[PDB]
Amino acid sequence: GDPDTEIRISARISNRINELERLPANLGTYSLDDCLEFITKDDLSSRMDTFKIKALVELKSLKLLTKQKSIRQKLINNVASQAHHNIPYLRDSPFTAAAQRSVQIRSKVIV
Amino acid sequence: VCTILIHFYPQGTRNYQLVDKFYKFSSELLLRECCRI
């Protein structure tokens, strides 16, 4: 809660999104392990893209945030929404068993 | 040795292109570092 310190979180994520979205698309690595492959004038080394994938996993994981929030809501509001049929130490207490037993009472037939 | 191995094989074999790539790599390796020296 406390939407004073909720905006101060949601203004640091826009920082990171508008800092990652100003990187050049022609970004590439040069590791110290391409010397063992003997790359010619035109040979297409196989470790050129170990930073541009990492600079898109962050940029697309920081846009799929309010999708995993909506999946976590559907998870928690269907695991905690039962809470008395799966957890063993709650469906064995006196009061929970008495309440579940007492909701199932069929109404009395007059005559 | 690279001209010999080019003329020895046909133009489509893999040992033609390996000698071509090896010539390119070694000529690039020997053009630089005698510019430093």
A42 and B24 in contact (C-beta within 8 Å)?
Answer: no
Cβ distance of A43 and B21 shorter than 8 Å: yes
| C-alpha radius of gyration, chain A, whole number | 28
Which residue's structure tokens are 């068993």? A97
Phi-psi region of A38 (alpha: psi -120 to 50; beta: other; left: phi over 0): left
What is the rounded distance in angstroms from the CA atom of residue A20 to the CA atom of residue A13?
11
Indicate the resolution in Å: 3.4
A41 chain-B contacts, CB cut-off 8 A: 24, 28
A50 and A33 in contact (C-beta within 8 Å)?
Answer: no
What is the rounded distance in angstroms from the CA atom of residue A45 to the CA atom of residue A29?
10
Taking the alpha carbons of A66, A72, A73, A74 in that order, is the dihedral positive or negative? positive
- Tell me how long chain B is: 37
A38 chain-B contacts, CB cut-off 8 A: 25
Interface test with A, best of B21, B22, B27, B30 (most A CBs within 10 A): B21
What is the rounded distance in angstroms from the CA atom of residue A55 to the CA atom of residue A21?
9
What is the rounded distance in angstroms from the CA atom of residue A59 to the CA atom of residue A14?
11
